[PDB]
């Protein structure tokens, strides 16, 4: 999968990057990536993360492993540093309500286990 990721980003394609995104081979892929081409991969991952809040179980392994092997090439591109410093600004803004949203997870783990409690008690009585 090392050579499918090279061609998908030079033409700024929308579809061909997603074909490789869902599929340890991922780590061995980006250690051989060209570094000016590697910054093109970070530009679109920061583009989708900044426009809308969400989640991605696969991209946490993806973004971190590229910022280590190809973060030293970020000095060559002045455009991407400003895009990453407004990205980490808005990712603070999701982080402010982590305390209030964890307390919401507590009440739902309380009420769902109490609604299951009475339903088991009707079959117990």
């Amino acid at each position: 999968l090392g050579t499918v990721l090279n061609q998908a980003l030079r033409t700024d394609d929308s579809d061909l990057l997603e074909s490789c995104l869902q599929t340890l081979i991922i780590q061995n892929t980006i250690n051989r990536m060209d570094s000016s081409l590697a910054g093109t991969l970070l530009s679109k991952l920061a583009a989708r993360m900044h426009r809308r809040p969400g989640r991605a179980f696969g991209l946490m392994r993806w973004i971190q492993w590229t910022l280590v092997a190809h973060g030293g090439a970020l000095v060559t591109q002045p455009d991407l540093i400003n895009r990453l410093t407004e990205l980490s600004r808005v990712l603070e803004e999701r982080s402010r309500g982590l305390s209030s949203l964890l307390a919401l997870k507590g009440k739902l783990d309380m009420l769902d286990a109490q609604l299951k409690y009475r339903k088991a008690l009707k079959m117990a009585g």
Binding site: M49, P53, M60, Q64, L67, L84, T85, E92
Partner: peptide, 23 residues
């Protein structure tokens, strides 16, 4: 949504440190 916010915390820390080093 909680897993999303925790993921945003991890990526926030890593990306902010890499951006400050790059600057």
């Amino acid at each position: 949504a909680l897993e999303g916010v925790m993921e945003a915390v991890r990526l926030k820390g890593v990306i902010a440190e890499a951006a400050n080093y790059a600057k």
